[PDB]
Symmetry: D2
Subunit: 180 residues, 4 copies
């Protein structure tokens, strides 16, 4: 059985960022299932690690809690990261979790990058911010980034969108089952 | 007017901090530049590493500490601004980003601004034009053309002197916008 | 009098790139008038300089037409750059022209940057493509960028957009009338 | 059947630094694919010798015989290496025109190594802020290891590390190239 790590960084409840994140992981689960394999998904909510993250900034060593999360992340077979859009780019908190990760923490890690906001005017946040981020860490980011614009759900656009979620999931799924 | 103000954000986490060092060089040159234009400068340097609790309190809640309220209010009231960030994972720091996330939509509208970053080498010098610039522009801050990327491995010598002249240029650019305001 | 240079890289006829570029120049012309000055607007069409660009690549020296264009460009008070969006970024023909300019060709040039596509999902091309380009040439680009999403015209959003054009116009005008 | 590699260089000078790092990548890719038990065919295109063909294809949707074989072999290739000198802090306009000229689905799923060169490394991020977004938009799969050749840092420990980086990029591409059906 494979493992799927998920990092959602929203601060709301219910969180839109968590929404799309689940739509993607579930889709990935279905895709890995279609390739004849079980998938264990473990979702990490950054809003729930603010204290530990804070500590890792003023201090140098990480809390047992944080240490367990990052070790499990680097052991997962696939990764999906998601984030809301503050100031036309990814969240500060979002970038903080990654600033704390070891240099070789995600090397070779299959990833789906995703963001969300009202409109799609900030969709290039994917290839101009998250992609350069995950690329720096040598993670192989599937070609299909998923930018969820809540204002465009329902109707032909939503069908098209849910269809794009599928492609991304297929892309990641292929990369996950191919691992030895 | 009766003494121009300058705000300086520095996101370094080491002691001593290389980010605070280029930040100081920048504000010192700005101080000289405003002096050359006949005026006086007041500088407010804000170390993000000293605001961690106030910052991550504004995260898990929507209200600011007296300290943060004083910082953000002066920031918006400032005539000039300088932002310096170390480079983590090939871009600005999450902590640096957090501060901005916390600001009002229009906290920095029209704010003359010099963007700056530092690291060992200059391989990531484009972090200015692809990460900090877009961020400051999105908030409608007017960013002076001369960004300042300090690669510590290239200090001193023919390179080090050329870099110090560069700081002055950014300083001059920012100084002009500063004394222009009325 | 003040001179405003305009670079339009449109290829179609009529050109949506020339349209936004015109709505831009016009607005600037007006705004420069409310500040008590006359503006001479000279619009350049890059599609009409094909054989020249094609020569400045294979050879090192420019042609009369091109040499008289760059000179007039580097001597204008203001500037406006417009371009279509091919492959989710600015035009190559567009980039080619700037590549041909001298190092200090636009140093200190007050500038408006703009682009035009169907939707707005590629609007970040302003800050992640043109801004860096113009900024590298030490040009001073007004905070207000103009992205004409031809579909979002008219209606409420259409109203907000015409204002944005005026804001940028006003911005450049001030820089223009401030130059002696 | 012999695997195919398409290469695109946008250097203007002669000799050309762009062409040189492109040859290294392609040669390194040939060894990597050789190590995996297969043979490799390499098609290297020099954009500065295709200018008129490009201008025509842009102004008109017509392709010269030369450009027709170039674009066809391109979409038909198993792997792609793209290289560009750095002008005005980004890729060449000539470089961009070429990709503007292609069909929207020309490189869909195409294994790719993006590269660029200059004197220093101050502009290395052109890779992940210009070329990468470009290739991604065309849904090509660009291997993690981009190659930026700072001609001022060859030789000694630095270059010794750079050649290894070239190898890592070739391995990544070679893998993608040979697992294709």
């Amino acid at each position: 059985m494979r493992t799927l790590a998920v990092i959602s960084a929203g601060l709301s409840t219910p969180s839109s960022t968590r929404q799309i994140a689940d739509s993607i992981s579930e889709a990935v689960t279905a895709a890995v299932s279609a390739r004849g394999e079980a998938l264990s998904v473990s979702t990490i909510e950054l809003s729930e690690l603010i204290p530990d993250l804070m500590t890792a900034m003023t201090t140098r060593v990480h809390t047992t809690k944080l240490e367990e999360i990052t070790s499990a992340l680097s052991a997962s077979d696939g990764l999906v990261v998601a984030t809301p859009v503050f100031k036309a780019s990814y969240t500060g908190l979002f970038k903080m979790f990654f600033d704390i990760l070891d240099t070789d923490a995600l090397t070779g890690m299959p990833t789906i990058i995703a963001a969300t906001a009202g409109s799609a005017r900030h969709s290039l946040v994917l290839d101009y911010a998250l992609r350069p981020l995950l690329s720096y860490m040598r993670a192989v980011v599937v070609p299909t980034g998923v930018f969820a614009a809540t204002e465009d759900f329902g109707g032909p656009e939503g069908a098209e969108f849910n269809k794009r979620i599928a492609r991304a999931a297929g892309e990641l799924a292929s990369l996950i089952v191919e691992e030895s």
